[PDB]
C-alpha cells in the first residue's frame, strides 16, 4: 500500500522504488534506506551513514559501539525482553501483552550441522 | 436432563513483575495455555487481585491494571508512578453441563 492505495510491483517515483525483485520485496528510498523483506520471516534495513547516532529502535543506535549503549536506559542495564518491549507501540484501540521469558533450552547442535556448515569452507 | 455445574478455579501467579520501564505483569490466557495452566475455553467471570496484598481490592490500589474475562490481566510499569507494578494474580470460573 502506497499512501493508502494498492500498487502493482514495481512502483517507481522520484527517489523511491519498490519491487518484487528476486525472492523478496525491496523498497529503496534513495539517500534514505534500503528495505528487503522476503515476505515471510526476514527483513533487512540498510541505512545511510548520515543517520549515525540519530536513530533508535530494535536496530539500535547506529553509533558504532555494540556492547555499551543499546541496553542501558537511565544508566540501568536491561535485557532483550526489556529492550524489545521499550520500543513498543500499540494500535489505537489495541493492548498487546508482553511475551513472557521462554524456559531453558535443549537440543543444541548435536549432529554438528550448524558447526559443519557455518564453520565450513563456504564461509 | 442436563444442568449446568459451575465452580471457581484456583489462583494463578505465573510471573513476577520486573523492575524498570518495560516491566510489569502480563498474565494472559495464551501464556496460561503455553505454561501448562489449565484454561477453560468458556467462562462467565474472572477475578484479579494483588498476590502480596490479598485484602485491599484493585480499585483501592489505584494503579493502572486492565483485567478482563476475554484476555486476562496486564499491569505495565511505565503507566504508574513510581513506574512499577505489584505482583498480581487471577482466577477464572469454569462451568460445564452434567446430566441430571
Ligand atoms: C553519539 O551520541 C551520544 C549520545 O548523547 C553522544 O554523547 C555522542 O557525542 C555522539 N557521538 C557521535 C560521534 O555522534
Ligand atoms: Ca550502540
Ligand atoms: Ca504474576
UniProtKB/Swiss-Prot annotation, chain A:
User: Which protein is depicted?
Assistant: Mucin-5B
Superkingdom of this entry's organism? Eukaryota
Q: In which tissues is it expressed?
A: Expressed on surface airway epithelia. Expressed mainly in mucous cells of submucosal glands of airway tissues. Highly expressed in the sublingual gland. Also found in submaxillary glands, endocervix, gall bladder, and pancreas.
Ligand binding (Cu(2+)): 46
Q: What is known of its domains?
A: The CTCK domain mediates interchain disulfide bonds with another molecule of MUC5B. The cysteine residues in the Cys-rich subdomain repeats are not involved in disulfide bonding.
Q: Tell me, what does this protein do in biology? A: Gel-forming mucin that is thought to contribute to the lubricating and viscoelastic properties of whole saliva and cervical mucus.
Location in the cell reads: Secreted
Disease field? Interstitial lung disease 2: A form of interstitial lung disease, a heterogeneous group of diseases affecting the distal part of the lung and characterized by a progressive remodeling of the alveolar interstitium. The disease spectrum ranges from idiopathic interstitial pneumonia or pneumonitis to idiopathic pulmonary fibrosis, that is associated with an increased risk of developing lung cancer. Clinical features of interstitial lung disease include dyspnea, clubbing of the fingers, and restrictive lung capacity. ILD2 inheritance is autosomal dominant.
Mind telling me how this protein is modified after translation?
Highly glycosylated. C-, N- and O-glycosylated. C-mannosylated in the Cys-rich subdomains probably on the first Trp residue of the WXXW motif. Highly O-glycosylated in the Ser/Thr-rich tandem repeat (TR) region. The repeat region is about 59% O-glycosylated with a high abundance of NeuAc(2)Hex(1)HexNac1-ol.
What induces this protein's gene, according to its Swiss-Prot or TrEMBL record?
Answer: Regulated by all-trans-retinoic acid (ATRA) in a cell-type specific manner.
This chain is glycosylated at: 53, 106
Subunit details: Homomultimer; disulfide-linked. The N- and C-terminus mediate their assembly into higher order structures to form filaments. The CTCK domains of two polypeptides associate in the endoplasmic reticulum to generate intermolecularly disulfide-bonded dimers. These dimers progress to the Golgi apparatus, which is a more acidic environment than the endoplasmic reticulum. Under acidic conditions, the N-termini form non-covalent intermolecular interactions that juxtapose assemblies from different CTCK-linked dimers to produce long, disulfide-linked polymers that remain highly compact until secretion.
Amino acid at each position: 500500500l502506497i499512501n493508502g492505495q494498492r500498487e502493482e510491483l514495481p512502483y517507481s517515483r522520484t527517489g523511491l522504488l519498490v519491487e518484487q525483485s528476486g525472492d523478496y520485496i525491496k523498497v529503496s528510498i534513495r539517500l534514505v534506506l534500503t528495505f528487503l523483506w522476503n515476505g515471510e520471516d526476514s527483513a533487512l534495513l540498510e541505512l545511510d551513514p548520515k543517520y549515525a547516532n540519530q536513530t533508535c529502535g530494535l536496530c539500535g543506535d547506529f553509533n558504532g559501539l555494540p556492547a555499551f549503549n543499546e541496553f542501558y536506559a537511565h544508566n540501568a542495564r536491561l535485557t532483550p525482553l526489556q529492550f524489545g518491549n521499550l520500543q513498543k507501540l500499540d494500535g489505537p484501540t489495541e493492548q498487546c501483552p508482553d511475551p513472557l521469558p521462554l524456559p531453558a533450552g535443549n537440543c543444541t547442535d548435536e549432529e554438528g550441522i550448524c558447526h559443519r556448515t557455518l564453520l565450513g569452507p563456504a564461509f | 436432563c442436563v444442568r449446568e455445574v459451575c465452580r471457581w478455579s484456583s489462583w494463578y501467579n505465573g510471573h513476577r513483575p520486573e523492575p524498570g520501564l518495560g516491566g510489569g505483569d502480563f498474565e494472559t490466557f495464551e501464556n496460561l495455555r503455553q505454561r501448562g495452566y489449565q484454561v477453560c475455553p468458556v467462562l462467565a467471570d474472572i477475578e484479579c487481585r494483588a498476590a502480596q496484598l490479598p485484602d485491599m481490592p484493585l480499585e483501592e490500589l489505584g494503579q493502572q491494571v486492565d483485567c478482563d474475562r476475554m484476555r486476562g490481566l496486564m499491569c505495565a510499569n511505565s503507566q504508574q508512578s513510581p513506574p512499577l507494578c505489584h505482583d498480581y494474580e487471577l482466577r477464572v470460573l469454569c462451568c460445564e453441563y452434567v446430566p441430571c
